[PDB]
Amino acid sequence: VLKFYKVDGNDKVTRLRKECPREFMAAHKNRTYCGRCGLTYILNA
RNA sequence: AUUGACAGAUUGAUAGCUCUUUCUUGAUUCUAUGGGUGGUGGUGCAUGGCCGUUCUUAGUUGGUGGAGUGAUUUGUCUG
């Protein structure tokens, strides 16, 4: 269910959706938003 | 398996209720069958408890004996 990256062989596995963690992001448009973070987080781009 | 939710959608609603979408939750719960659970739902003509009223008045029982075949009476009475 965390299979959706750009997977690679020998031996690196590169990731997608770059996190900005409070003390992986949803992506529809502009904003990045973190699921687990209890206070909800917004940064447009 | 179920949960928390941004900005729009939708809504009185800064209830993510349900969503167009996509991040998360980590076995608490969901799915159905049986069965519980709860109610200022019905019944005071199924009841308890409490209160009012009959009744602010003076009244009410049984023990032994007497009367009567008996229900009952006498005691509880003329003054």
Structure, explained:
The PDB classes it as ribosome. Keywords: Toxoplasma gondii ribosome, rRNA, rprotein, ribosome. Small subunit of Toxoplasma gondii ribosome. The protein: Ribosomal protein eS31. The chain is low in regular secondary structure and 45 residues long. The chain has one domain. Helix content is 0%, strand content 9%. The protein has no helices and two strands. It has strands spanning 25-26, 33-34. A hairpin with a 6-residue loop joins strand 1 (25-26) and strand 2. It is elongated, with a radius of gyration of 13 Å. It binds one RNA strand of 79 nucleotides through residues 17, 24-28, 30-31, 33-38, 40-42.
Please list the strands of the largest sheet in the order they lie side by side.
1-2
Counting helices, strands and paired strands, the structural category is little secondary structure
Please tell me what the overall shape is.
elongated
Number of domains: 1
How many E-type strands? Answer: 2
Distance between the termini: 26 Å
Helix content range? under 10%
Using the CA coordinates, give the radius of gyration: 13 Å
Give the topology string: H per helix, E per strand.
EE
Strand coverage percent:
5-15%
Tally of individual helices: 0
- Regarding quaternary structure, what we see is part of a larger assembly
Describe the largest sheet: 2 strands, antiparallel
Task: Give me some keywords for this one.
1 chains; 45 residues; little secondary structure; 0% helix; 9% strand; RNA-binding; ribosome; rRNA; rprotein
Secondary-structure map with pairings?
Blueprint: E1 25-26, E2 33-34
Antiparallel strand pairs: 1-2
The chain binds one RNA strand of 79 nucleotides through residues 17, 24-28, 30-31, 33-38, 40-42.
PDB class: ribosome
Keywords: Toxoplasma gondii ribosome, rRNA, rprotein, ribosome
Entry title: Small subunit of Toxoplasma gondii ribosome
